[PDB]
Every structure is written in C-alpha cells, then in structure tokens.
Amino acid sequence: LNDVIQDPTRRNKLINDNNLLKGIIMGRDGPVPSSRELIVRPDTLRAIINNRATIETTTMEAEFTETLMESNYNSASVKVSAPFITANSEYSESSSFKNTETEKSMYTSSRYLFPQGRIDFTTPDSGFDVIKLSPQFTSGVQAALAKATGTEKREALQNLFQEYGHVFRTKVHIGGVLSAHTMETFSRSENETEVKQDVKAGLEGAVKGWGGGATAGHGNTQGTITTSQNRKLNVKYIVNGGDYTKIQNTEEWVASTNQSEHWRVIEVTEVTAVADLLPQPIRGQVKDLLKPLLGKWVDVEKVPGLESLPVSVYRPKGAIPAGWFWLGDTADASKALLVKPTLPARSGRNPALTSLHQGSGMTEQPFVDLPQYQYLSTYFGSFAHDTPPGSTLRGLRPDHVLPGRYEMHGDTISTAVYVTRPVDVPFPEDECFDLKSLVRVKLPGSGNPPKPRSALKKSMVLFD
Amino acid sequence: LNDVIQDPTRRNKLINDNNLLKGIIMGRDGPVPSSRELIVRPDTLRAIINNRATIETTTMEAEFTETLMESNYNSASVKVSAPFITANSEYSESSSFKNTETEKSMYTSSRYLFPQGRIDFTTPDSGFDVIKLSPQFTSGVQAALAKATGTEKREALQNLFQEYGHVFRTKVHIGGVLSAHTMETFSRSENETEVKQDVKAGLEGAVKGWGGGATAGHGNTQGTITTSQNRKLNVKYIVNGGDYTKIQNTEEWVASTNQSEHWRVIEVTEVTAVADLLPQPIRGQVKDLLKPLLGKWVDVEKVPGLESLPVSVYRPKGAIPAGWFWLGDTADASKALLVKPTLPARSGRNPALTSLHQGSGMTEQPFVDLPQYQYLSTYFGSFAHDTPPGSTLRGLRPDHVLPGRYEMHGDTISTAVYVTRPVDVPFPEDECFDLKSLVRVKLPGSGNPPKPRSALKKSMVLFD
Ligand SMILES: [Cl-]
Ligand SMILES: [Cl-]
8 A cells, every 4th residue: 555655664665766866867868867866855755545547648749759758758747858858869860750741750658557646746836745955966056056157157057967867757656557659650641630549549459458468468578559540550568567577467467566565657747847946046047057049139131132032031130240140031120039059069969059061952952960950941042051141050959949830921832931930829838939930832943951840949048 | 924824713814805715707707706615614724935026927819818817817827717718708899809810919917916925725636635625516516417418417517617617726826916917919020029028028117117116106097108119008007905095105005915904816826627626537527518519520522623722622421410510621531520519509608609601792701600709611612601511511619729730732822722730839738630621822802701720629529
C-alpha cells in the first residue's frame, strides 16, 4: 500500500530508486537524471491513492520528443520539457521524422498503467509541505550571478543547468507499466483525425493484448502491428516497474507490481522548469540571462526591383551593427528585428543561429548550414553568403520557432506571396513576434528549399 | 493580516462577502454568483501571503469575454470560462468587436493590485483539506441522471448548471484593486506585437498614474487615453475592495485596503468547470450528456460541374437521416460528419445550430439566420434554404468553433481554393476535427459573406 510505504525508511528507498530529488537533464541521450540533488530530502511524500489499472495514449506532433514519449511523459510534461530537448538534440539531415510540404510525422505512445498512486512535489508559491531547493544548488545560482561579465554569468548558469537539470518532475505516477511506442509518417491529403484515431486504436489494442494476458508474453522488444486501416507500424515495447525477471508470464509480472520494492515511475504527469522553482527576484534575473538572443528594433528600407509583387518588400535599413543579424524579408514598413547571440560558440553546443549557403540546384534561395535549423522568409533576390545583405542573414535553432499562419496576397499565383503571422488561437500558451515574414507562393526553378511557415518565440529574445 | 483573518469567525465574513462557496453562472449579464452553495463550508482557508503591490495586464482576442476581463479574470480563468459565456451571450449584428478580413479586435485590461494574499480551493483528485461538493448539488446530479430519457437527463443537467454555475473559482487574490479596461480595433496590416505593446503601455501608464496618487483621483468611471503611437482609447475604470467612500483621495483608499472588512476578490487566478469537480464515473456521464451535438460519420459523393476546380468537392452521400445536419463542402473523399442537436429549442437559449438563407446581394452564398453564428465552408453552387442539399446545411454557435488554418490549392487565383485544417501548434489545449472544409480564394460577385476559417471542437460532439 502507498500509505504503508510512506511511513518508515522504505519511503527513502522509493525516493532513491526513482531519483525523486533530482532534476532531469534534457540532452542528446534523452531525459537523464542529475547526479546532484536539486531539493532537500522531505520528511513525507504527498501521495494520492489510485490502484485502478487504465490504458492512456499520447499523440505528439513535436519533433525531438521521442525519448520523452518513451519515458511515458504525458503531453503537459512533453510541452514543458520540449524547448530543452529540442535545443540539446543531435540534429541530422537523415531523420525519419518528416515534415515536408506533402508529408507529416507524429509520435504515438500507449501505456497500460498498473498504479499504486501519484506523488506530488508542491512547488514554491503554491498552497500546501513545499519544495526547498538544496543549498548546493542555491549557492551555484548565487555564484553564477556573481560573475564579472554578462557572458560569464550566462556560461556559469548554462553549466549549472547541465549539471542540475532543466526540469524537475513535480507529479509522477508510481507502480508498474506496459507501454508501446510508435512513429507514423502520412500524407497531408489524409484526414488527420482518422489517421490519429487509427494509430491510437491499433496501439491501445497491442497494449491491451499484451497486458491482462491475451497475446504471447515478452519484455522490452521491437515489434510490428497492423491497424484496422492497413497501416503497418514499427512498435517499441517498454516495461517499467514490477519484477522484470517475471515478464515472460504477464500475470506473474502484474502480481509483482503490488510489491513496494518493484514500484517505479510509470508516468511523468507534471514537470516544472528548474528556473521556475527559484524565488521571485533571482527567478527573473536567471530567466533573462538564459535567453539565447538579444533583440533590437531598427528602421527598414524597401527592396528595389519588386514592382511585380502585390506588397512592398523590406529589409533592415543598416548600417547593421557589428555582431547583429537579421532574419528575413518582411512586409513590415515600420520596423525590423535584429538579433545577437548571448552565448559563445562551443563544440557540442547547438548555436542559437546558423549561417546560410545558396543551394547547389538551379535555385538562388538560401539553405541552412546546420541541419534542421529553420528560417522565416523566402529570399527576394539572389542569395550569397559572402555579400550583403545575405552575409548577415541567419537561420534559427528549432527550439526558437513555432508554426505560423499565412495571409495570402496577389492577383496571380506567380506574383502571389504569403505574409507570415502568429497563429490566431484565442488562448495561446506561447507568444510569438509578428514579424510579417514574406514567403513566395510559387518559387521559380527546381531544387528550392521547403517553404518556411514559422514565427519566432518572444521568450527567446532579451530587450535592453 | 491574512493569517489573522483566517483564525476566528471573520474568515466566514471573508467567505460570505466574496461568495467563495458559490459557483459562477456565465450568462448574458456577465459572471453572476449562484444563490446556492456549491461546496461545504470549510473549517480553514488555504492562504498564501503576498502584500506586494503590482501592475498586471491581460490581452484577449476572444470575443464575448469583456465581462470576464472587467471582473479581473486572468487569461487562464478566461480560457476555462470562455465556452460558457460564449454559449450564453446575447448575439448581435451591431457589436463593436470586429473580426473581418481587413480588421481585428481585442480587449486589454490592466490592474493595479494592492493584495493581502491568495486563497486556494483544492480540487478533488489533487494533493493537500480538499473540496467537498454540497449534498444539495450532489442530489441534483443524481436526480438529473435518474430521468427516464436522454433528453430529460440533459434538460435537468442544463437547469442544474444554470442554478449552480458553470465554473468555480479555485484560486483568487484578496485585497484591493484599481483597474482599467479597453477594447481596440485595428487593421490586419499593422504589426500585432507593436499594437499590443502600445495599448498595454498606455493602459499600464493610466493605472500607474491613478494608483499611487499622481493623476486626479476618481472612482468607477469612463475615460479616454492616448497611447505613445496616437491611438485614442475608450477606458472603463473599475475599483474592487477597499473603502469606496475614500476613493476620491487615492492614498486614503490605499490605506483602507489593509482593513480586513474591505478585502474583496481582486483577481480570479484559476477557475475550474463545475462538472470537473464531480467524482470519476459521474463526471464522464455528465460531460457526455452536456455535449450539444451528436455525431455520425457517413459516406460522400463528388459534386458535379466542378471540373475547373483544382480539387474534388464533396458532400454527404445521403439519404441524410431525419433530424441530422451537414456542415459544408469538403475535400475529404472518404467520410463526412453529420450532426444532430441534443437539446430541444427553447426561448432564451442559443441553439447549437442555425439554418442559413441566401444573401440579398448579387451573391448565391449562405448567410447565418442567427447573428454571430459561424459556418465552415464556402458553398460550391447556388444556395437555397428550401431545396436539397442546402435545406439540411447548418451553421454553428460560436462556442463550437476555433480558428483553423488554410492550405491553398490551384494554379489560378480564380479557381484557387483553401482546404481548412486544424492549426498545427505542437501542444494544443483544445482539439478540433480535421474536416478538410473547402473555402473559395476569390468568390465571384459582390455582397459575399466573410470567408470562413474555422474548425469544429471535438469536445462538442458525442459519438455512439
Ligand atoms: Cl544545397
Ligand atoms: Cl442578406
């Protein structure tokens, strides 16, 4: 029983085995627990009893989240952890996750939970026993903010989060779990609702058949499933908790999930960013210093030889200050945003920006130098990385951008352009800049790069 | 002091004066407290001490939220309350809130908070003292679910929420507040970021000048402000808490906010839907019965005489069952969604669906019979409300839809169409159906209705 475990020193076994005192490092190797304790060891754990077995499913369209899906993070935990795994991922041109003009990808994870309960860590500035950060971490923050220069403070803070972790798990389900994980690539011509429901039912069916003893028993393995609509899927099967030596006989493994010794984290229900646990004044100072870009609003000038276009095309009217960069052609006649990276370049660290090169095809459009980086606008001219204004044009690390929305302008497809705006959902969780990024509807020639449809996140840019 | 008030019977004065035990009715007259108690009177209130005065701002693009903005609900509370005020609002063709092809509107509220603390009501199935629903409400739910037919159960549940409320305030700030509320209509050609920041700084400046004693003192009133960018705004000034008889001398009012007797709710920090407070089995039964539409997937047939179009146009292949309705022309060659309302028509109650009429202009497109209702597709032909398939075509109540996203198709503007898809944000709070709703890029003739860009919410449709 959950209440029984929380009473003596066996609650310390539950805390220690599950790394409940440690922040989670979001890196290229997936979610990794810190070797250092983030919080002070509590006298008691806040537990909600729930022994009801259920099948839960998570559908995820965000790239770089596969290791979080496989660690049974729910959508709310993936959301908070997503900028950190994205920023620290190993980018590749050969990824199977495809987001093209004709195709899209998604991850689907189903989990047959055999729980005992939920453990809650009360965050500071919330009603309740509350989280107390370890003095070792607090001293690290103080030592980081005490550095002579802005660059030194940011480098020490970066080192501090790489050691302590990016997020802390504030709500976790404890018990045993049998989970199935998949990825699917489908045509944009398909009904998204039909594809999602078909993959979810097929995955739920596989975990349902595995759990409760109906299919041939197995442990951690790879398998293939066929949905009702004939989609063939590569499935990864994962076991967490219970006695793994008993996994061959499903019902014997299920019974072993009632043993306090074999209880493990079975779902990450809620996660909090480590910087958000910091007290009120320091919190804002740390968060400002963590922003990868500096921002500046500057004057614009109209691009000549664009009389054919339905709208006026703009670029910063510089005199672009040394070390500053621009992000693409705009329909904003008033101002342009310039950006400057706050962190020095280091081997193993993904920079906030990437330079661009003209494509080897018949095209004159830029291509990102660093794989999987994104840019905001089509280039209205002939790009060259060695000549202005292309020499100071930059692409962005994928954690910096979210999908935008097009507003089409033009009386002919050949002259037609899209003006990128932030999505107009009434209750956004994240806010983006309205930069009025210009995208060509029909680009001339072949070998042209995928058309951008992105908006820059406001949380990534520090002003003044 | 907050801790001092919570100890004797003066905590009951704080609970009673602020209606902390009552659900909030979201109707045409704004947020109205229920006359009936939703929860059992607690022995103690969970309080977080915070006497730090701050200026907070909320920007809201959602229509029908003005009375929530004026009641100092933050964006998270507006979000949860929004479907309920939208569904119960008094619709009008003469609203100043404009969302056209060339213009958009938004609400901005700034509040100069003079707090004492925050009161938290712990929801059932959450760590902590927890909420216990009143036996009068619980008996009402049981009596509603005991009705002979589906229609009778739904009517009794509707009556139950109109009496008890749609939402419950789970986190509230207590003290005194000076707030300014405005609305702004601007051209889509404008930078949204610049407009939002300009209105927020102008509104923050007005509350800053009012509070702390710098401008001429006043109480609840209407005024005009001018932003840094020469935008002229109609401002509504509201006072909550403190001694209102002392409002003329700002500093005397500020000092009166430290008196336990004058503490009022100053911000609605978190709100929970009343149905979400219900225990696990009943919760799902109530939520299914509250859905305004029944759903059914049916076969489609291609619309003839559409050879010129870049895509195939579809309508349900009916034999449309009696009492069922369709929602517009689609590019979905496999299936079509049919809808049926679950509640009977009643005077004063906004129906889930509206019939349509052909516009009096040169147009052949349908127009909603009920003001402010929305539809999903342009009609690919000549609409008539008295002939099939137009006789069974229906528009939707604004709470049923969210903005969608266009995917353009066509080699000529005149033949070009948009296929509506759900927004592709990676972490949506709300999910919509992908219906592949077809919208004409360039409609022939004048007097044509505003082009739709909407997706139907999945939470509004009950299947099987
Ligand atoms: Cl290339
Ligand atoms: Cl009309």
